[PDB]
Amino acid sequence: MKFTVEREHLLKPLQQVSGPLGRPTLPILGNLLLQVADGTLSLTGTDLEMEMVARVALVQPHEPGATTVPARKFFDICRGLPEGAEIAVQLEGERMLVRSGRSRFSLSTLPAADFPNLDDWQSEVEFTLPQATMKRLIEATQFSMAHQDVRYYLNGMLFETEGEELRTVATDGHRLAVCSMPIGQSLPSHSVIVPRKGVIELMRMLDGGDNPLRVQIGSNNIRAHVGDFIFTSKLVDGRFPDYRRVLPKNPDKHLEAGCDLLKQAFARAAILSNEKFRGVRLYVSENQLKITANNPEQEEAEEILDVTYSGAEMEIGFNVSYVLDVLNALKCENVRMMLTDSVSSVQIEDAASQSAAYVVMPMRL
Amino acid sequence: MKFTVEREHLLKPLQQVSGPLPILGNLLLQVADGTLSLTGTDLEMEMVARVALVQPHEPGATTVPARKFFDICRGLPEGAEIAVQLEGERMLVRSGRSRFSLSTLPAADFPNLDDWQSEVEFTLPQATMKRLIEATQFSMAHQDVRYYLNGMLFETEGEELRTVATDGHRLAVCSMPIGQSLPSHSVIVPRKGVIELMRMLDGGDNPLRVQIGSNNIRAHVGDFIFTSKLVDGRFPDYRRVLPKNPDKHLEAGCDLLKQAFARAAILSNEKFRGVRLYVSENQLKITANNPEQEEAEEILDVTYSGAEMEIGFNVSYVLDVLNALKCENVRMMLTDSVSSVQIEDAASQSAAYVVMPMRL
Ligand SMILES: C[C@H](C(=O)O)c1ccc2c(c1)[nH]c1ccc(Cl)cc12
Ligand SMILES: [Ca+2]
Ligand SMILES: [Cl-]
Ligand SMILES: [Cl-]
Ligand SMILES: [Cl-]
């Protein structure tokens, strides 16, 4: 295996394929697989649950073969060479040599044949969509995923295809986010859970250019192709909660207000909320929202805002971090809150669109 | 105690005094003679900021939680007016229809640095003080048992102010002219003090007044006053640290040398990163290896005079120097494999660096 490649054509691929990898559990999992075949250098990184592959075209002389080498060390070497450096690589059994100018490096190898390899699988649905749509879908919901919950299915994001819609859903059992976007082709009904790190990888591979994303889903795997990057993950083997059953059934009290005005008021009140429980109290009355916070030390914050509200007065408590997370994800002019009573969840949406919806349970407070 | 002031006028003061037990997490607010003073302290140093009060106000003082008060002010909208009124065990803060009640501790409980007397005084541009500290601060010790190294020497000599910092392995010294004849004097400022002083100094052209006592230093710029205790011990004499007669001279591009060190270090021991330098006629070779038997080699074209020699260095020590220099060409002055080396910018003799070698 031999190749020579310009520094900048190797650098972003190395960064991308290292995504799935600080302290590898076993050494080969801290390595990348390098493969030269048919005019292409392929680079692969994996954590045993997902893999990221980059294809790099070779315009300079090369010889086929494969090995694995430490990802961080190889990336750092390539990054540290000067702009435009020509990076020559040659496999020499238990070592891989790297040379550029009068810089020389020898890296320890492990066999390509020992590199873990996600199984082949069969796609059952395939579709294309703009990068921006996938970005919107994930950014709208990712913050509501659980983190290290014993309920493993919640530490992932539901991807659901239905008719001409792709939908993401995330929840940690306290708050839920759901987003639906049209794709312009009719899809079979599929519902799959993508693991935490996989959602991060999908997000990371979106360059923000005009390349479309091609998605394939099977029973136990998902794959996304963007440019010369191919991401594949195993799916989480569980049954996700149904968002339709958690949306409040008849939330007739409707509040409308400016997103940023609400966000900044909640942020200020939060300063004097209980440090652990983060509770704020909302008092809604005719065209007015009062937000109060107090902590065990008896300090107090009060914010009064002009809003549009016609329903009955009520008082309801929320974890202010859950509210702030939603307002931060909406990034819109105006927000609608849909309330029922003091012991029931609130539904929050962009006043302009029902494409995303957020459900937050109240606090006893 | 009552005042009303624009948020804008509080922001910089608040960030400055939030820099240094429970009452130490509070700020002292004092209204007197048409001024609001804000003070923060950690018992070893204090920062005072003053803000003029044109709106009606009433004298008095209290202490409130620093981070809470700062976060409230910062969290209010651009252009906000902030009204404050003391109500016994609470301090009321009002802006528009935002209202806050903070718990207070009495002003009388707020720690004061003992009064002291100035012995040496001079004014210099804050830019000069920044340059002196930036040139040297990275060589201070952190939490050494030799407490006098956990800080920076400030020395006046002739017409110069000099800073010296060392951790026992490497040393930095920088001298700048201040345009007046000074007494010969030296004090050690604690490292946390150095960092707080440095953070008080922005990019402006602004006179800085320094007053040094037996046990304290004070620095005044604009409407900020920083005071710190000094460290009471015997600081090493940099003159005895500088190589006395280096007979080997290496000159190389600063950035080329930096990047070669940085690359080679990738394959050094991760827990203790060093490289070997081999100097010979017109060339520098830098090598590294690790327990996995991985190896790096860098060859540079350099200007060199002297006998061939091999010498090792701690990567971080050399990188810290080259990053501080930010110049075109660097000079290294060597003696032998077991002796310290001096490193300087080829085009400036304002700062010098000494680094002990590392055995590999
Ligand atoms: C503790 C002792 C001292 O004189 O205080 C000390 C302080 C600084 C240094 C040293 C020994 N030995 C050294 C060798 C090299 C350098 Cl750069 C600095 C030092
Ligand atoms: Ca809107
Ligand atoms: Cl190339
Ligand atoms: Cl090579
Ligand atoms: Cl004012």
UniProtKB/Swiss-Prot annotation, chain B:
Purpose: Confers DNA tethering and processivity to DNA polymerases and other proteins. Acts as a clamp, forming a ring around DNA (a reaction catalyzed by the clamp-loading complex) which diffuses in an ATP-independent manner freely and bidirectionally along dsDNA. DNA bound in the ring is bent 22 degrees, in solution primed DNA is bound more tightly than dsDNA, suggesting the clamp binds both ss- and dsDNA. In a complex of DNA with this protein, alpha, epsilon and tau subunits however the DNA is only slightly bent. Required for DnaA inactivation. The RIDA complex (regulatory inactivation of DnaA), composed of ATP-DnaA, Hda and the DNA-loaded beta sliding clamp (this protein) rapidly hydrolyzes ATP-DnaA to ADP-DnaA in a DNA-dependent fashion, preventing reinitiation of DNA replication. DnaA inactivation is stimulated by DNA synthesis.
InterPro entries per UniProt: DNA_clamp_sf (IPR046938), DNA_polIII_beta (IPR001001), DNA_polIII_beta_C (IPR022635), DNA_polIII_beta_cen (IPR022637), DNA_polIII_beta_N (IPR022634)
Family to which the UniProt record says this protein belongs: Belongs to the beta sliding clamp family.
Region (1): 1-114
One Pfam entry name: DNA_pol3_beta
Applied relevance: Small molecules can bind to the hydrophobic cleft and inhibit binding of various protein factors, suggesting this may make and attractive antibiotic target.
Subunit structure: Forms a ring-shaped head-to-tail homodimer around DNA, which can be opened by the delta subunit. Binds interacting factors in a hydrophobic surface cleft between domains 2 and 3, each monomer is able to bind different proteins simultaneously. The beta* isoform probably forms homotrimers which probably load onto DNA. The DNA polymerase III holoenzyme complex contains at least 10 different subunits organized into 3 functionally essential subassemblies: the Pol III core, the beta sliding clamp processivity factor and the clamp-loading complex.
Biological process annotations from GO: bacterial-type DNA replication; DNA damage response; DNA strand elongation involved in DNA replication; DNA-templated DNA replication; error-prone translesion synthesis; negative regulation of DNA-templated DNA replication initiation; regulation of DNA-templated DNA replication initiation
Region 2, residue ranges: 123-237
UniProt keyword annotations, A-Z: Cytoplasm, DNA replication, DNA-binding, DNA-directed DNA polymerase, Nucleotidyltransferase, Transferase
Source organism (scientific name): Escherichia coli (strain K12)
Superkingdom of the organism of origin: Bacteria
Record-given protein name: Beta sliding clamp
Residue numbers spanned by region 3: 239-359
Signal peptide start-end: none
Note: The temperature- and UV-sensitive allele dnaN159 does not grow at temperatures higher than 37 degrees Celsius. The global SOS response is chronically induced. The UV-sensitivity of dnaN159 is dependent upon Pol IV (dinB), it has an enhanced Pol V-dependent mutation rate (umuC, umuD), and is absolutely dependent on the polymerase activity of Pol I (polA) for viability.
Main localization, broad class: cytoplasm
Induction: Part of the dnaA-dnaN-recF-gyrB operon, but also transcribed from at least 3 promoters within the upstream dnaA gene, induced at 42 degrees Celsius. Induced 1.5-fold by hydroxyurea. A shorter isoform, beta* is induced by UV treatment and also at low levels in late logarithmic/early stationary phase growth (at protein level). Beta* transcription induced by naldixic acid.
Residues noted as binding DNA in the record, renumbered to the chain: 67, 143, 147-148
Any one cellular-component term (Gene Ontology): DNA polymerase III complex
